[PDB]
Amino acid sequence: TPRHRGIFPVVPTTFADTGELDLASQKRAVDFMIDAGSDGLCILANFSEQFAITDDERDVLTRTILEHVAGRVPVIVTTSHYSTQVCAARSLRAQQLGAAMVMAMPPYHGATFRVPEAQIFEFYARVSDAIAIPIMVQDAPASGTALSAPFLARMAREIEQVAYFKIETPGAANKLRELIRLGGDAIEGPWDGEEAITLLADLHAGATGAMTGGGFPDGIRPILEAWREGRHDDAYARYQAWLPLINHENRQSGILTAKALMREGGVIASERPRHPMPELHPDTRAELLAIARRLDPLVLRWAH
Amino acid sequence: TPRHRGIFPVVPTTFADTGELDLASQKRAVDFMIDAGSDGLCILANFSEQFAITDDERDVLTRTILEHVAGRVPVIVTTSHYSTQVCAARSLRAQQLGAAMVMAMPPYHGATFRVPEAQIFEFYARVSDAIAIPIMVQDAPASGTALSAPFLARMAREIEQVAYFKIETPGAANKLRELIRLGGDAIEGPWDGEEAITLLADLHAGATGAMTGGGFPDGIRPILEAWREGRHDDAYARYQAWLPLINHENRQSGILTAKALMREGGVIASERPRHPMPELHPDTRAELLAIARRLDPLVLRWAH
Amino acid sequence: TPRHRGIFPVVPTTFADTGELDLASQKRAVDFMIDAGSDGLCILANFSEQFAITDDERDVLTRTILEHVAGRVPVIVTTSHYSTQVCAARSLRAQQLGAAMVMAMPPYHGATFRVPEAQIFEFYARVSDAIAIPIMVQDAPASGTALSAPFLARMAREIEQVAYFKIETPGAANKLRELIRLGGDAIEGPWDGEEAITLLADLHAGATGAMTGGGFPDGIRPILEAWREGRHDDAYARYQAWLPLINHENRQSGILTAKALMREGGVIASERPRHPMPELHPDTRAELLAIARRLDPLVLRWA
Amino acid sequence: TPRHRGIFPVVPTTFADTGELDLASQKRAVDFMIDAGSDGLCILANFSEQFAITDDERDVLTRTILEHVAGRVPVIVTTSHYSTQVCAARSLRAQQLGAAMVMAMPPYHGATFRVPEAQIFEFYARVSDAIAIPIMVQDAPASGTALSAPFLARMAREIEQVAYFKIETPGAANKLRELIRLGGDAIEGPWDGEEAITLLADLHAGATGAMTGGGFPDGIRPILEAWREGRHDDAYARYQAWLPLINHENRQSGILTAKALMREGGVIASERPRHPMPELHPDTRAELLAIARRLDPLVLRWA
């Protein structure tokens, strides 16, 4: 019934050691993530370090990744901007390059620039008017913006392209419950995020998709498959086995988790963030790899 | 002693009602602000709605304004970006177009992405390494980032281009006092902002420059002139006369103040912000103009 | 129509230099504030350093101040607490001690403990059930809690004692406009706060009362009187003359403004806050007194 | 060398169906937590719903719990208050009633009242001067106050009783590493919190104690025992087994987790919070118990 479901991991942005885009590693990262079983990919999100790249780089990356994916899986392009017209233009460009969906935070800037509900509604309505592909509303702490379940459901019911949701604020499971109740069939994609840290609770609440980190979608996807098939005990057992790694990503190694794994595995040439984002503490990295090696993820045995 | 002192108002970004850049009104605003007596200008700051424009637009505005100013007054170009290399590249481009100085917030994104002191220091150090013009550190609530007076003084002493400071966090006067005490001659420009709302206290604290709104620099500049000449009572009397307008800008009409005054005066064609930023409440606008008309500001009698 | 209007300044809590309550100074501060023309008083609010005192001290101060006022002016007692039952009990105690009104923030704690709208409604509904005097809902940044104009108006319409509001979040004037419109005759008291810094805009918006600092209500009250009488230009003139002092209180000397002035004038024995609240920088204090002397407020010539 | 180490779970506050304190259930919860093997107990913290109780209730709970513990295990009494003198008085009273240690957040109030580093130092220095038992500094999001590792280490080196730390801000493991590096043997207790969600990473970083929720200390303590004995694989296996329950507590059922489990097990009479704190969603509670029953915790087979 929904056009999209399952696991849509966030593609990290691969830099060279000196900070320029490393497009050769970017393509390998994409190929690994498809081989790991991803149902689709999300690019230029926060786990992609989007705040560290330029508009020109955003376009190069969108072109490069969509062309390299070559229709194998659907791609969600994150297009957030404070300006309605800028977001609409980015979203139309992403559509013309082959995106299956765009994702946008509500408009915000920094710690203090926020937008009232009425204008947030207009923002998403005008982005929807400009495109013919679905919009995923991102509900995440980084925007510092409250998007209530009734407001989110109203957008799904009333705005043509608003149909998908990445719910990552605290209490996401019970918010997903309310979103589904109020939105009904207009909620095509009640999805969660935050590296799958709350995936078990969110599946109980009705989530049908998960936007995870890019390092081990092969570890997480069978949880969603087991859940959809009614194999709830198998889903729990898989969640339990992978939860220490999900937890280390969520709390310790963060955005850089996927790149540290891909570098250790020979998928990418450099795991560095763009300065000034702090590099991983060597103990945090060592502990990451120690947990990962217990689980034998594809990322450490793909390039070899 | 210092290379720059006095009033450096923020140039608003002028749009058509449609949201496109209005570069004709943009140049008229610049000419009015120079005619009002500004010692210099600051572009692409938060009162310029910089969060609502693209990289391409940033370059168009920088080139257009610097060319139109044509060396009549120094221009500070705001170049903030999370990425060190992006900020350095923007700052070099601003220099190449004729900027006297760049202003940069510390690296941040949204409500949740913050950078430790050690990496903030490296951020400014690397921007400094790239350019020949001075850096103004912006200390403002929008970044959600704490920059202590000891830390700011250390950057002034240890980083070649860090020499100017826009202090607009709460308690700016006593922060300016401590910055000057700890930094000495390395504090070339202890400046304030926030539309001049705390100008009197900040002058007592030793501020030598003020980054105000663009609607009435002619009202504010004689306060700084009087202060420098030791005419403290003339400064106070002028502050008292203009404080209700400063206060209405700070608390009621905000960013759109300068544009509402400029539109009423025929300086610019449209006072609208870029969507989704809310437009001015009609009563807020009417009360703004009522206060301004008590003060005979140049913006309402600029016959060019 | 309304039971209460005008200026209701916040009474500072007077401590000895040692930190103990100084009740002798507390009573003098109250007497000065009444002599300054206050239409009423508000006690135990944030400008009273309520976060620095104990429950026992709250009760001592409520009893002492209400007895000393002796019905001369109405007193709003601030009773905020996270717990509904504790707030309701404090409010009933305040009523029994002679309060004309209670003020309560929505329930909150610290930076992170917040309460959904539905339970905030139940909080105020249950406090209202316990008492027979009106409630003032405080809409202020300290709570970190969003109270929309429609929600506030719904509480006024549906909860018997909810009838007054202290609006001091950013954009208070236009929130007051919407609250007054949506709430209609249920909005008995649309008031502002924040030391009167936005008073002119808030009066344009329909505010009928102002909860200010306690140092110079005589400076501010004629703005409200002029406004009520239609003398809008006189109101502007008074606002303009006093705005540098209001601005210094709002941005520089803060909570300690009233006590610094009262100590300079000999009204109270000590201007000190309770530790760890920072003491005034000496230049901040000197600049405060320099502005104040120019305006000749009662506090410097009362004792 | 440290005086205290191991697992010190937070004791929930048990209310009756009426919202009054239920001291009979309170004592049973203490007995269960001791029977579960706790090395010590922490009372009146935020996981104890301390923001919902009165000063009188705080004193009754401190007396009741310390007397009931009867010296069986050491008790940390949380004494946070904005006022230095109030915190010091609470801490001295806790000491006189038998507390082994006090825990205090830095002084704060609400979303907006914060204290500069210099006055935070003075706050802890003066509390230390008042008492003869150690202080645990709580580094937690609820205070909205930044306490850098250099500042925490400085307090440990310069303030006699500051010796223990509950680090539960984001990135606690890296912060604990830096605190230990900078403070040396002045850091007697580098501990973590947040229900043990980051316990494995924090143990790698040098944590010697954990302040967890009160529902299943028996599940968590073997992780710390294995770590201290060098059985790092055993620690991982136990952490992995219990992490789904820790995670559900941390993200879904929160403060009420321990009370829901204790009520289900017959330890306490009522699991309600005080109004207006939201009650547990029925699905969240059912899912909590489903996970818990896979792990056979003592709380469901105690009474």
Paired tokens of B86: 């992006």
Residue of chain D whose Cα is closest to the Cα of C279: D119
What's the farthest any 2 CA atoms get from each other in chain A? Answer: 53
For A85, the closest of B85, B141, B275 (CB atoms) is B275
Q: Is the dihedral of CA B282, B284, B289, B294 positive or negative?
A: positive
At A136, give phi and psi (nearest 5°): -100, 120
**CB-facing half-sphere around the CA of C22: CA atoms within 13 A:** 23
Cα dihedral D284→D289→D292→D294 (10° resolution): -110
Q: What angle do CA A128, A130, A133 make, to 5 degrees?
A: 60
B218 in any annotated domain = yes
Determine contact, residues C287/B204, Cβ cutoff 8 Å.
yes
H-run or E-run covering A281? none
| Distances from the Cα of D238 to the Cα of A293, B8, D291, angstroms | 18, 62, 15
For D276, the closest chain C residue by CA position comes to: C119
Q: Helix, strand, or coil here: D139?
A: strand
What H or E segment, with its residue span, contains residue A166?
A: strand A162-167
Q: Is residue C225 part of a domain?
A: yes
- Give the residue on A whose Cα is nearest the Cα of B124: A276
Check CB contact under 8 Å for A141 and B112: yes
Closest of D223, D278, D263 to residue D39, by C-alpha: D223
Give the whole-angstrom CA distance, residue B253 versus residue D22: 54
Asked if residue D20 belongs to a domain, the reply is: yes
Touching chains, D (3+ CB pairs < 8 A): A, C
Task: Tell me the β-bridge partners of B67.
Answer: none
Exposed, middle or buried by CB within 10 Å (0-12, 13-18, 19+), for D169?
A: middle
Q: Tell me how far apart the alpha carbons of residues D167 and A5 are, in angstroms, rounded to a whole number.
A: 39
CB contact under 8 A, A85 and B278: no
Q: What letter does residue D272 receive in the DSSP assignment? A: P
The answer to whether residues B111 and A143 touch, using CB atoms and an 8 Å cutoff, is yes
Q: Taking CB atoms and an 8 Å limit, are C247 and B252 in contact across chains?
A: no
Q: How far apart (Å, rounded) are the C-alpha atoms in residues D265 and D176?
A: 36
**Which residues form the domain of C164?**
6-300
Does the CB of B86 have a partner CB in chain A at under 8 Å? yes
Q: Which pairs from C57-63 meet CB under 8 Å and 24+ separation?
A: C57/C21, C58/C90, C59/C93, C60/C21, C60/C23, C61/C13, C61/C21, C61/C26, C62/C93, C62/C94, C62/C97, C62/C99, C63/C97
Burial class (CB within 10 angstroms; exposed 0-12, middle 13-18, buried 19+) of D141: middle
Report the chain D residue with the minimal C-alpha distance to residue C113. D142
- DSSP readout, B89-102? HHHHHHHHHT-SEE
C55 touches chain D (CB under 8 A): yes
Q: Do D204 and A283 touch (CB under 8 A)?
A: yes
The vertex-A150 CA angle with D244 and D281, nearest 5°, equals: 35
CB contact under 8 A, C141 and D116: no
Query: How many angstroms separate the CA of residue C200 from the nearest CA in chain B?
Result: 9
Any domain includes C65: yes
Our measurement of the distance from residue B139's CA atom to the centroid of its chain's CA atoms, rounded to an integer in Å, reads 12
Chain C contact present for D85, CB below 8 A:
yes
CB B23 within 8 A of CB B58: no
- What's the domain count of chain A? 1
Query: Would you say residue D214 lies in a domain?
Result: yes
Displacement of CA D249 from its chain's centroid (Å): 14
Given a contact cutoff of 8 angstroms between Cβ atoms, the answer to whether B107 and B140 are in contact is: no
CB-based contact A55 B53, cutoff 8 Å: no
Question: Touching check for D293 and chain A: CB below 8 Å?
Answer: no
Residue C136 has φ and ψ, to the nearest 5°, of: -100, 120
- Residue A170 is encoded by which pair of tokens? 């605290």
CA distance D25 to D269: 6
Cα A223 to its chain centre, rounded Å, is: 17
Q: Which strands, in side-by-side order, build the sheet including D41-43?
A: D6-7, D209-210, D189-192, D162-167, D135-139, D101-104, D75-78, D41-43
Residue A224 backbone phi and psi in degrees, to 5: -65, -40
| CB-CB under 8 Å, A240 with D241 | yes
Task: Provide the b/e sequence for D230-269 (b: ≥16 CB within 10 Å).
Answer: eeeeebbebbbebbbbbbbbbbbbbbbbbbbbbbbbebbb
The three state secondary structure string of chain C is: CCCCCEECCECCCCECCCCCECHHHHHHHHHHHHHCCCCCEEECCHHHCHHHCCHHHHHHHHHHHHHHHCCCCCEEEECCCCCHHHHHHHHHHHHHCCCCEEEECCCCECCCECCCHHHHHHHHHHHHHHCCCCEEEEECHHHCCCCCHHHHHHHHHHCCCEEEEEECCCCHHHHHHHHHHHHHHHCCEEEECHHHCCHHHHHHCCCCEECCCCCCHHHHHHHHHHHHCCCHHHHHHHHHHHHHHHHHHHHHHHHHHHHHHHHHCCCCCCCCCCCCCCCCCHHHHHHHHHHHHHHCCHHHCCC
H/E element holding B291?
helix B282-293
Beta strands per DSSP E along D133-252: 135-139, 162-167, 189-192, 209-210
Asked if the C-beta of D290 comes within 8 angstroms of chain C's C-beta atoms, the answer is no
D119 Cβ neighbours under 8 A, 6+ residues apart: C275, C276, C277, C278, D107
What are the beta bridge partners of residue C7?
Answer: C210
Q: How many residues can be counted in chain B?
A: 304
Amino acid at D178: E
Q: Say what the alpha-carbon torsion angle A249, A255, A260, A266 is, to the nearest 10 degrees.
A: 120
Sheet (strand C75-78) strand order: C6-7, C209-210, C189-192, C162-167, C135-139, C101-104, C75-78, C41-43
Q: Give the list of residues 6+ apart from residue D145 with CB closer than 8 angstroms, or none.
A: D105, D106, D108, D114, D115, D120
Q: Give the C-alpha distances (Å, rounded to integers) separating C17 from B221, C30, C65, C86, C269.
A: 43, 19, 20, 31, 8
φ, ψ dihedrals at D228, nearest 5°: -65, -30
With tokens 């905000």, the residue in question is B254
Q: Is residue C219 part of a domain?
A: yes
Q: D-chain residues within 8 Å CB-CB of A251?
A: 170, 197-198, 201
Q: How far is C80 from chain D (nearest CA, A)?
A: 11
- For A254, the token pair is 């963060």
Can A166 be counted among the known catalytic residues?
Answer: yes
Per the structure block, which two tokens stand in for A275?
A: 């300065």
Which experimental approach was used here? X-ray
Q: Work out the minimum CA distance from B1 to partner chain C, whole angstroms.
A: 25
Cβ <8 Å between C174 and B201: no
Helix (H, G, I), strand (E, B) or coil at A165: strand
Q: Which residues are CB-neighbours of A18 under 8 A, at least 6 positions away? A: none
Sign of the CA dihedral A41, A43, A49, A51? negative
**Strand D189-192 relative to strand D209-210, pairing:** parallel
**Residues C299, C303: Cα–Cα separation, whole Å:** 8
Contact C177, C253 (CB under 8 A): no
Which other chains touch chain C, taking contact as 3+ CB pairs less than 8 Å apart? B, D
- Answer yes or no: do D52 and C108 touch at CB < 8 A: no
Chain position carrying tokens 């002191």: B117
Q: At what angle do helices A172-183 and A149-158 cross, to 10 degrees?
A: 40
The C-alpha angle A277, A283, A284, rounded to 5 degrees, equals: 50
Cα angle C241, C246, C248; round to 5: 110
Q: What is the CATH number of the domain that holds B59?
A: 3.20.20.70
- Separation between Cα atoms, residue D265 and residue D267, nearest integer Å: 6
- Out of D52, D109, D116, name the one closest to residue C83 (CB): D52
| Secondary structure element (H or E) that encloses residue B283, with its range | helix B282-293
C-alpha–C-alpha distance, residues B22 and B60, integer Å? 11
The SS3 of residue D152 is helix
Listing from the earlier edge strand, what are the strands of the sheet with B6-7?
B6-7, B209-210, B189-192, B162-167, B135-139, B101-104, B75-78, B41-43
Nearest to A141 among B19, B111, B143 (CB): B111
Report yes or no: A300 and A293 within 8 Å, Cβ to Cβ: yes
Spatial CA neighbour of D211 closest among D140, D145, D279 = D140
Spatial CB neighbours of B220, under 8 Å, sequence gap ≥ 6? B7, B196, B199, B210, B212, B242, B246
Residue C43's alpha-carbon distances to A19, C50, C193, C211, C212, in angstroms, are: 59, 9, 14, 11, 12
Residues 6+ apart with CB under 8 A from C80: C50, C87, C103, C104, C105, C107, C138
Which two tokens mark C154?
């719904």
- Please say whether the beta carbons of A174 and D281 come within 8 A: yes
Q: Which residues of C are annotated as catalytic?
A: 166
- Coil, helix or strand for A42? strand
**Residue type for B161, please?**
Q
3-state DSSP call for residue A244?
A: helix
Chain A positions touching D177 (Cβ under 8 A) are 281, 283
- Collect all residues with Cβ–Cβ distance below 8 Å to B64 and sequence separation of at least 6: B23, B26, B27
Do B188 and B1 meet the contact criterion of CB atoms below 8 Å apart? Answer: yes
Q: Which helix (H) or strand (E) holds D78?
A: strand D75-78
In a domain, C62, yes or no: yes
Chain A CB contacts of D251 under 8 Å are: 170, 197-198, 201
CA–CA separation, C255 vs C8, rounded Å? 16
CB pairs below 8 Å between A and B: how many? 117
| C1 in a structural domain | no
- Residue A184 C-alpha, separation from nearest chain D C-alpha, in angstroms: 19
Please list every residue in chain C whose beta carbon sits closer than 8 Å to the beta carbon of residue D53. Answer: 83, 86
Measuring CA to CA, which residue among A146, C47, B205 is closest to residue D109? C47
Residue of chain C with shortest Cα separation from D120: C276
**Taking CB atoms and an 8 Å cutoff, what residues of chain A touch D243?**
240, 243-244, 247
Label the pairing between strands C135-139 and C162-167.
parallel
Minimum-distance CB partner of C248 among B177, B201, B251:
B201
Residue from the list D205, D244, D251 with its beta carbon closest to the beta carbon of A240 = D244
How many residues are given for chain D? 303
Rounded to whole angstroms, the Cα distance separating D192 from D130 reads 26
Among candidate residues A97, A304, A76, the one with its CA nearest the CA of residue A212: A76
From B100, B106, B102, B108, select the one nearest B89 (Cα to Cα).
Answer: B102
Chain-centroid distance of CA B162 in Å reads 17
DSSP state of A253: I
CA distance B273 to B285: 14
Query: Are B201 and C281 in contact (CB < 8 Å)?
Result: no
